[PDB]
Amino acid sequence: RKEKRKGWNKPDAFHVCIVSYQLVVQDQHSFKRKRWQYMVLDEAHNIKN
DNA sequence: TGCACAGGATGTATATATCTGACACGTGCCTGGAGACTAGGGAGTAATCCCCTTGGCGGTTAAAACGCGGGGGACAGCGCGTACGTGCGTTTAAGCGGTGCTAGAGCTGTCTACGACCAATTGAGCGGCCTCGGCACCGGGATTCTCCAGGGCG
Numbered sequence: 001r002k003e004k005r006k007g008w009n010k011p012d013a014f015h016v017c018i019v020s021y022q023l024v025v026q027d028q029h030s031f032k033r034k035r036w037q038y039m040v041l042d043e044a045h046n047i048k049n
Numbered sequence: 050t051g052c053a054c055a056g057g058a059t060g061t062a063t064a065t066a067t068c069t070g071a072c073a074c075g076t077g078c079c080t081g082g083a084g085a086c087t088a089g090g091g092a093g094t095a096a097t098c099c100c101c102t103t104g105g106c107g108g109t110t111a112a113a114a115c116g117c118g119g120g121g122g123a124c125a126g127c128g129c130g131t132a133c134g135t136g137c138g139t140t141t142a143a144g145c146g147g148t149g150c151t152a153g154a155g156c157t158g159t160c161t162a163c164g165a166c167c168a169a170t171t172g173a174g175c176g177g178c179c180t181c182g183g184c185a186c187c188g189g190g191a192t193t194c195t196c197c198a199g200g201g202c203g
Contacts, residue, residue: 005187005188006188006189008188009187009188009189010188010189020109022108022109022110023109023110026110026111029185029186029187030186030187033186033187033188
């Protein structure tokens, strides 16, 4: 993940990113820094709580 | 003449009177033993609330666990030599017996500052709160920093 995040910030290396549900719990501090346009949730019956 | 002896002239442990030191016994003045009054500090209870558990499925991650290569560092063997161990004679100085002192250690009245004990005020310090600027974590990039392969050199 560090190797994925070293081409991350300054330029645009991707038009979309694929991140698992549970990884945003640990990496929430890193993912909250970058601005985003669309964040979509699959099978929302998880987050329902 | 060469020799044994009878008694004095010195030693020497032996037995007796004598000199410290420590245990043992008989007192009387600062201690304990005990009796009564006060009272606030300790034993006991009625909510309480508040964080701390109960029991176990799964999914996933970061940390724990195992496995091999080998590199270098622990470690055994062994020779050296000088640095203390051991043994003499020679000296300086403490141990100890005894002395003349004193100046500071040590027990006792005076009173007098001066701190113990107790009402009245409050304000400075403690419970409650709610923010934002310093802090937490990480990318970007430059910088250093060590690892490995010649090769010019033995």
